[PDB]
């Protein structure tokens, strides 16, 4: 209905300039990205017949 | 008399001194030890250079 629309914006170069404790500011970290590397494991199930 | 100005003079005055031929005969000694060793760095929280 156009009421609530969708955006992406930048970071005011006043805020970005001092980010994570510059010029006396605090409590404002940068955002970070890591990675993970977790593993999977399978097992071999058997099977068989007779006559 | 060598008449030096004092360009910042909070009232007014003239201070009649003595400076001998030697640097030993002075009345006050300004002895430099190290000089303006420049230092640099960057705070890794905010990355922005301090000097």
Coordinates of C-alpha atoms in Angstrom, one line a residue:
Chain A
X1 CA 0.0 0.0 0.0
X2 CA 3.0 2.3 0.0
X3 CA 2.7 3.1 3.7
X4 CA 5.8 1.4 4.8
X5 CA 8.4 1.5 2.1
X6 CA 11.9 -0.1 2.0
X7 CA 15.3 1.6 2.0
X8 CA 19.1 1.2 2.5
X9 CA 21.2 4.2 3.4
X10 CA 24.8 5.0 4.3
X11 CA 26.5 6.4 7.4
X12 CA 26.8 10.1 8.1
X13 CA 30.5 10.9 7.6
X14 CA 30.3 12.7 10.9
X15 CA 29.5 9.3 12.6
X16 CA 31.6 7.1 10.5
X17 CA 34.7 9.3 11.0
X18 CA 34.7 8.6 14.8
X19 CA 33.7 5.0 15.2
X20 CA 34.7 2.9 18.2
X21 CA 36.2 5.4 20.5
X22 CA 37.7 8.3 18.5
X23 CA 37.6 11.9 19.5
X24 CA 36.1 11.0 22.9
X25 CA 33.0 9.2 21.6
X26 CA 32.2 5.7 23.0
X27 CA 29.7 2.8 23.0
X28 CA 29.6 2.9 19.1
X29 CA 31.4 -0.1 17.7
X30 CA 32.1 -1.0 14.1
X31 CA 30.2 -4.0 12.8
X32 CA 32.2 -7.1 12.1
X33 CA 32.0 -10.2 10.1
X34 CA 33.5 -13.6 10.9
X35 CA 33.2 -17.1 9.4
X36 CA 32.5 -20.4 11.0
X37 CA 33.6 -23.8 9.4
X38 CA 31.5 -26.6 11.0
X39 CA 31.5 -30.1 9.7
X40 CA 29.2 -33.0 8.9
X41 CA 29.8 -36.8 9.2
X42 CA 28.1 -39.8 7.6
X43 CA 28.3 -43.5 8.5
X44 CA 28.2 -46.5 6.2
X45 CA 25.2 -48.7 7.0
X46 CA 25.3 -52.3 5.8
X47 CA 22.8 -54.5 4.1
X48 CA 22.5 -58.1 3.1
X49 CA 20.5 -61.2 2.2
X50 CA 20.7 -65.0 2.2
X51 CA 19.4 -67.9 0.2
Chain B
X1 CA 73.4 46.5 25.8
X2 CA 71.8 44.1 23.5
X3 CA 68.1 45.1 23.8
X4 CA 65.9 42.1 23.1
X5 CA 62.2 42.6 22.9
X6 CA 59.8 40.5 25.0
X7 CA 56.9 40.5 22.6
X8 CA 54.4 39.2 25.2
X9 CA 54.7 41.6 28.1
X10 CA 52.0 41.3 30.8
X11 CA 52.8 44.7 32.2
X12 CA 56.0 46.3 31.1
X13 CA 59.7 46.2 32.1
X14 CA 63.3 45.8 31.2
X15 CA 65.5 43.1 32.6
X16 CA 69.2 44.0 32.5
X17 CA 71.2 40.8 32.2
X18 CA 74.7 39.4 31.8
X19 CA 75.9 36.9 29.3
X20 CA 79.7 36.2 29.3
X21 CA 81.8 35.1 26.5
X22 CA 81.6 31.5 27.6
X23 CA 78.5 29.4 27.6
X24 CA 79.6 28.5 31.2
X25 CA 79.1 32.1 32.4
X26 CA 75.4 32.7 31.9
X27 CA 73.2 32.8 34.9
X28 CA 70.8 30.2 33.5
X29 CA 71.5 27.2 31.3
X30 CA 69.2 25.8 28.7
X31 CA 70.7 22.4 28.0
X32 CA 69.0 20.4 25.3
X33 CA 69.0 16.6 25.7
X34 CA 66.9 15.1 22.9
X35 CA 65.1 17.1 20.3
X36 CA 61.5 16.6 18.9
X37 CA 61.7 12.9 18.3
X38 CA 58.5 12.5 16.2
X39 CA 56.2 9.6 17.1
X40 CA 53.4 8.0 15.1
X41 CA 50.7 5.4 15.7
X42 CA 47.2 4.4 14.9
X43 CA 44.7 3.4 17.5
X44 CA 43.3 0.0 16.1
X45 CA 39.9 0.6 17.7
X46 CA 39.2 3.5 15.3
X47 CA 42.2 3.1 13.0
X48 CA 42.7 6.8 12.6
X49 CA 46.2 8.1 12.9
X50 CA 47.5 9.8 16.0
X51 CA 50.9 11.5 16.2

